[PDB]
Amino acid sequence: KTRRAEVAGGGFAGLTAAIALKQNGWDVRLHEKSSELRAFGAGIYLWHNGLRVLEGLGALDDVLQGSHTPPTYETWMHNKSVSKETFNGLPWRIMTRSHLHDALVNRARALGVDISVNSEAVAADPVGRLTLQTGEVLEADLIVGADGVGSKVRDSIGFKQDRWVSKDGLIRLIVPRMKKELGHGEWDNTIDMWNFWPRVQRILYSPCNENELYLGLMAPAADPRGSSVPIDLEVWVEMFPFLEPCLIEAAKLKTARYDKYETTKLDSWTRGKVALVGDAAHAMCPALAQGAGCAMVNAFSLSQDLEEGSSVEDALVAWETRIRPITDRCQALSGDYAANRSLSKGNMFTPAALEAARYDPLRRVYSWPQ
Numbered sequence: 203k204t205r206r207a208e209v210a211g212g213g214f215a216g217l218t219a220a221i222a223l224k225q226n227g228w229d230v231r232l233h234e235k236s237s238e239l240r241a242f243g244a245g246i247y248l249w250h251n252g253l254r255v256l257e258g259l260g261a262l263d264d265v266l267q268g269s270h271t272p273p274t275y276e277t278w279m280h281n282k283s284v285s286k287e288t289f290n291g292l293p294w295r296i297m298t299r300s301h302l303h304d305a306l307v308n309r310a311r312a313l314g315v316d317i318s319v320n321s322e323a324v325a326a327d328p329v330g331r332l333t334l335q336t337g338e339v340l341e342a343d344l345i346v347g348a349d350g351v352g353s354k355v356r357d358s359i360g361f362k363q364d365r366w367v368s369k370d371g372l373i374r375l376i377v378p379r380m381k382k383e384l385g386h387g388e389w390d391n392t393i394d395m396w397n398f399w400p401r402v403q404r405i406l407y408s409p410c411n412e413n414e415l416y417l418g419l420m421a422p423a424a425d426p427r428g429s430s431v432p433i434d435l436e437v438w439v440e441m442f443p444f445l446e447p448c449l450i451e452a453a454k455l456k457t458a459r460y461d462k463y464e465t466t467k468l469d470s471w472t473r474g475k476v477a478l479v480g481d482a483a484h485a486m487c488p489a490l491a492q493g494a495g496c497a498m499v500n501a502f503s504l505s506q507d508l509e510e511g512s513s514v515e516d517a518l519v520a521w522e523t524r525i526r527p528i529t530d531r532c533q534a535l536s537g538d539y540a541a542n543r544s545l546s547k548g549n550m551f552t553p554a555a556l557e558a559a560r561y562d563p564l565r566r567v568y569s570w571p572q
């Protein structure tokens with residue numbers, strides 16, 4: 203009598219899906235292919251939409267404790283401040299990835315979500331079957347493909363996919379704030395530090411709390427010094443000398459990686475009893491800082507549509523129809539911003555840019571008007 207769900211992927215999308223379903227009385231098992239539950243990418247921004255998902259998941263308190271809302275989101279071009287934005291009170295937050303992940307994992311475990319590590323999904327059947335790498339076949343009423351950009355769940359079924367890969371990437375790190383050492387300034391702000399001269403180098407400066415600073419060091423792949431890991435300290439200090447104390451700390455991180463990005467748009471997100479959520483369905487450009495935000499909204503919204511008394515297959519179709527346009531629009535605008543380097547101008551968090559952020563998944567309305 204109890205509905206059973208199998209979720210592939212222990213990232214933000216899968217954990218959100220698992221918690222939301224479990225709260226609604228589903229028996230839920232989650233599979234993570236890695237040997238342990240961990241989140242990579244150093245730091246992350248969430249906004250009102252994702253904070254509302256966290257509220258709905260009962261995971262908000264653990265997130266807000268030990269995370270940070272800057273006094274303002276500031277943009278520089280060539281060390282000149284070009285904008286300071288506060289989004290008319292719209293809630294937002296910066297945190298380490300591990301901080302968000304821990305909150306979600308703790309909540310999943312408190313609810314009794316069955317979590318299997320070293321467990322890899324390699325195929326899904328729309329009739330409600332999930333196959334693991336070992337050969338084990340699991341039957342369920344709902345299968346969730348939350349297994350990231352290279353989703354085997356998705357690819358085992360076959361979806362029409364618009365794929366794009368970025369030639370350029372960035373190096374994302376957590377370092378000590380070194381706040382005292384930074385001297386005079388507004389070092390609690392988000393500061394997006396753009397430059398095109400003398401070279402294309404950018405740092406997104408993102409405090410996570412009183413102890414930890416999230417840095418995104420961005421340079422073209424064709425730049426053999428700026429794209430180097432561990433970081434080429436000299437070329438970063440040269441263009442960002444006011445961050446030297448933090449950059450010296452960053453240079454100690456020998457695990458640093460230069461990560462490129464892909465985007466994904468699919469003809470649909472569903473097939474029978476299989477739903478694709480998160481990057482598996484809709485990986486996007488990071489300009490609007492909404493990749494995980496949309497992923498969490500979508501995973502949460504999936505649980506909502508499964509409460510309507512419909513068959514799982516109909517609920518999944520209804521879910522995509524209801525919730526997908528917010529993501530399609532956000533993904534498109536982020537792509538345009540990225541292609542045009544729009545954020546470099548500052549003042550670009552317009553009402554349209556903030557549309558995904560303004561969405562409240564709990565009440566299903568748009569809040570915090572701009």
Ligand SMILES: Cc1cc2nc3c(=O)[nH]c(=O)nc-3n(C[C@H](O)[C@H](O)[C@H](O)COP(=O)(O)OP(=O)(O)OC[C@H]3O[C@@H](n4cnc5c(N)ncnc54)[C@H](O)[C@@H]3O)c2cc1C
Pocket residue numbers: 210211212213214215216233234235236240243245246247248321322323324348349350351354355372462463479480481482485486488491492493494495496497
């Ligand atoms: C540079 C950059 C910056 C970003 N900044 C932000 C930001 O500030 N704010 C924001 O909201 N979003 C941001 N995003 C986007 C965000 O990182 C993603 O949208 C989000 O992490 C997607 O989560 P997911 O759970 O869908 O996928 P993933 O995070 O990829 O997680 C899937 C989980 O999949 C597990 N797995 C993979 N294959 C299998 C398998 N076969 N079987 C079982 N498990 C499997 C993976 O190991 C992992 O544990 C950023 C993205 C990039 C690239």
Ligand SMILES: Cc1ncc(C(=O)O)c(CO)c1O
Pocket residue numbers: 247372406418487488489490491540545
């Ligand atoms: C929060 C954020 N905003 C914008 C961008 C961007 O691509 O301009 C990135 C990439 O790291 C971000 O992480």
